[PDB]
Design a protein around this nucleic acid. Sequence first.
RNA 1: UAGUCGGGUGAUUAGCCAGACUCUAACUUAUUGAACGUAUU
Lengths: 308, 208, 215, 220, 220
Amino acid sequence: SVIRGLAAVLRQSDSDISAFLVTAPRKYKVYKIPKRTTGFRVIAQPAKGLKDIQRAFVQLYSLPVHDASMAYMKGKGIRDNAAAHAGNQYLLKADLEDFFNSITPAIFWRCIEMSSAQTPQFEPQDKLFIEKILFWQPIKRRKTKLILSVGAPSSPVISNFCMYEFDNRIHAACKKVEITYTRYADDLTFSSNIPDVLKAVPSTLEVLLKDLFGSALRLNHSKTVFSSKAHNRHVTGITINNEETLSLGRDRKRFIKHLINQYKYGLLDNEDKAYLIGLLAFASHIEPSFITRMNEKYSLELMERLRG
Amino acid sequence: TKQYERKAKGGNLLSAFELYQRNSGEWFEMCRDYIQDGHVDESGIFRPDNAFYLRRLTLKDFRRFSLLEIKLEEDLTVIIGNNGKGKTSILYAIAKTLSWFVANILKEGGSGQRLSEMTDIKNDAEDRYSDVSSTFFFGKGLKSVPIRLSRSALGTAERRDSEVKPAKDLADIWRVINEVNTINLPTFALYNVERSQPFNRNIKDNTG
Amino acid sequence: NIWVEMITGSDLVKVTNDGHDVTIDQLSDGQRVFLSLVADLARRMVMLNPLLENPLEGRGIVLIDEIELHLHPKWQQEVILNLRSAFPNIQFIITTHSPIVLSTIEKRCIREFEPNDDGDQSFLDSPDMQTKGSENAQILEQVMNVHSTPPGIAESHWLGNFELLLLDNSGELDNHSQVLYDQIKAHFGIDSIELKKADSLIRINKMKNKLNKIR
Amino acid sequence: RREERFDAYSQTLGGAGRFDHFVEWYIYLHKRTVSDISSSIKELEQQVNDLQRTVDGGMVSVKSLLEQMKFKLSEAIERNDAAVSSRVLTESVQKSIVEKAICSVVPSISNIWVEMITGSDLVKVTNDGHDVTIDQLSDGQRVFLSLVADLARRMVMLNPLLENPLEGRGIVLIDEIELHLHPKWQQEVILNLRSAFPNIQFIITTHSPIVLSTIEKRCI
Amino acid sequence: SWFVANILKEGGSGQRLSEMTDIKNDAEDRYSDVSSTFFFGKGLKSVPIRLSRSALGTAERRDSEVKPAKDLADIWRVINEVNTINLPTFALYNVERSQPFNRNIKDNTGRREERFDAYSQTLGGAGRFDHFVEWYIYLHKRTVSDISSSIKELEQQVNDLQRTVDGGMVSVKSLLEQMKFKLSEAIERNDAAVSSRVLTESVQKSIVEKAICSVVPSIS
RNA sequence: UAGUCGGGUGAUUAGCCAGACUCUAACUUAUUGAACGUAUU
Ligand SMILES: Nc1ncnc2c1ncn2[C@@H]1O[C@H](COP(=O)(O)OP(=O)(O)O)[C@@H](O)[C@H]1O
Ligand SMILES: [Mg+2]
């Protein structure tokens, strides 16, 4: 049935879809992307044919996603995530270990079975094809190790779905004690105006993770961080200032000013110019007031010329 | 790369070093000045511009501890308690972490020490592994150097990996910069109760 | 002072210890062990900091377990101060059982286990009392959770018992209170703080009783 | 060699004790408590009798084995007799005495026993409410355990005729009694030692005012 | 040493160069290399190996390159495991070989009879003449004895013991099981000896005797 | 005091100035994929 649906969407024969899916878990290109400091991240991207199938699958089957999930959501993002916490003085951040690569077919099917919201029902015969669509086989020799890859177009949707019940429970629990909760992929954020309530959250998280996923998904305890208005606070790369407003942060703002000054004297190369323009668009989205101030500091004429 | 150039010019040590390694002047001098620059205070004591110290330690299922977090002072931290509260365990955990810096200052890809699979895992821990997590600070250009030492109990089929690459990355900077132009190097030492020994002038080490 | 002699035909390190020239082998265990710590550390710092005017101002992390090991109380009052002055940029992480050592350290530097922990405590904290400059007996009780007088010794309770007897007999020395007084005098001595306290109790209680009778 | 009575004088004045010898001796005692020699003698007697019947039945090939088993039996009886002849405390009682001494004197230790784990014999302790191996104990706990264990072993070996062998005579020298001890333990250590070993002359050195608060000035 | 280690054990390690003594004191590059090329027939004309060591604190580490030696040694080891082959001899005889003879010779535990004892201390510098003497005496004892007579004798003893257990003496069952195990071990050793395609002890002895008398002029 | 937030100035990622904050307590991250912003259409 999944096959028939996909074939219809992709205007292909049932036979050619089925044939393609036989070795779909191995149809990934693996490459490295540089980290910002030192080192590399390893990425696995599906082949084009498989990407098309994955996109079709996601289109055909709507899986539930909690409102606290901020990542990969239409009409939401990092600004909304940060804004949810901007009014609260105390902040907690937690992170999940090897989030995408921890999600296996077993976890996926368990989540389908457990799901409190309405899930699509799949015929047992379709389950094998679904696994081949959604999960990557990193080790050629080991046919039994299938995992989600961050590089696959379906992986955002599946990962958000797998966290649906988790998000339901923890959101409800937090609301009772006046804690704001959001999740951006593997990044969990908690905030509150009440002192000494966020201390209990990490223990609560560990229990819930064990309950729902056993030992498959775990907290990265090294990445659990408490903060307050005494210290720097950021959420998904957005600074929350002490006036409870979203900010790019002083250092980034000063860097942008530096680049504008360089441009003013014709010292910016084309690459740096392009970089500056891109970054100003982001600045306009996060902190529009900053753009106004730059217009005042640098002459509207200069800035308009730059943004042409 | 242009991204590394921007970070390096912003004062990031690791980016400056990466640029030095790929183009092998400017970047070398940035790295060397980061390590060597400092001033003499009012009391006549030299103070490095970029301090090096252990910020935070976390112990998970390690010996008596199920999960424990400790924030350390930059200058002096004193741990107190009754016998068997885990004071010596804490210093042991730190010493093993520091062994990764020492090994990599001595040799590229040197191996530091490991947690014991026989003794260091908490006896009644349901997960059968231990983690020792540390963050070090090295000035505002390298605010966080995270290390994790891990070990699974003897017998257990799943084996938990250590994460030591940040230690190696920093120790590489010290080692490589020193080889080109001499710099001052950090001292790491443990003095446990084993320091009380009988003396022997007659026994001499003919080893190095 | 410390120096090398070779004139006997074997290389000997000598020290001036308490005004007497001795070999390292002649030092007490306490002196030797402490000398060893400092000598070793100083050697390493000199070798690793060739470009500093004062190589002992180099960077590093030093861990010391049981800093008071083999030290008399007199030395315990100096050891942390001396180390910090000689090695001003080292991060020291130390363990101790000594209230005398704690009397020389700020409360912010101290990390203390909760008294009935059992290894599930999540974060360590500093004591509530300021330790630096405080009396050792206060540190014993307020930080180390130990009585300043040994509770397992009967004589430690005699003054308390004496006071209770005095209060039972409207402040007058009865036969029983006199016996205990004599025991306190005999045990602690005529010039003891304990006897002075007993004397004080007698004086105050007699005067209180006289006031009560006037009323 | 650890079962020989005069092993109690081995390296007695060397300064460290021999805690290794204690562990060996204690495991030995445990094995003998789980299996007494008399049943082994009875079993050996039965085996010798069975082998003698086979030799009497015409199987001359097993005569060499019979002679070996008779030798083993004679040796077992002799050991039993020597043990009997030495008027020595039973191995069970010896074990119990030492265990009680350790538990009474060492505050953190409530129990000590020998486990067969996997292949080999291991001494375990209940320390601060938790079961641990000796190599898991803190240095303070281990050092003090070692002192008491060693002393109790030697006293048991040297005083076989006393109801309580720890009430024997002797002279014990201890340098820095407070070594590795928290103040709380320093307040109990002299009382515990004198209670466990009432007839020993103790000559000790200390730096601790807390220890001194428990001792009469005449002893100082 | 790298060939010997890998013939004995998969992933065996040979000896490494010393940072202290093997590196030239005034080496500009601050590392040392020992490079060797071996030949093994026209099929493997070049087997390169390099032992390397760098000074402490150098910017780059110099590692050894030993994989070709290990690969070749692995072929010898694996093929030999399936079907016995002849193996290469490696030996060093330094001036240390001049040393006096211990007249007292050790009791045969039976390490000397094992084939890969031939690689024991082979590159140490002195040989092991003591091992020769032990091995040679062992060979003599086996030549004068019959082999399988112990098995036949053990077979007879197990048969006699089986008859006793069948006759109602259940107490000797433990002894029967022990003897059956000994018999099985003896057969297995015999079979392993049979399986290992080793020369008879008599022949081995003769070969060595001839060699010694041929090479050493004064010895007839 | 320290650390943090950041309005301004400053051929400007620095420095300097002004104002503020303080649950024991941020460490700025990752693409070609996904989503968001801008451009192109
Ligand atoms: N693997 C383990 N599991 C459980 N408890 C352990 C383990 N290892 C050690 N312990 C316990 O931890 C304590 C060790 O104390 P230690 O670290 O030496 O502390 P201290 O120096 O304060 O005496 C003892 O209470 C010992 O029984
Ligand atoms: Mg992009």
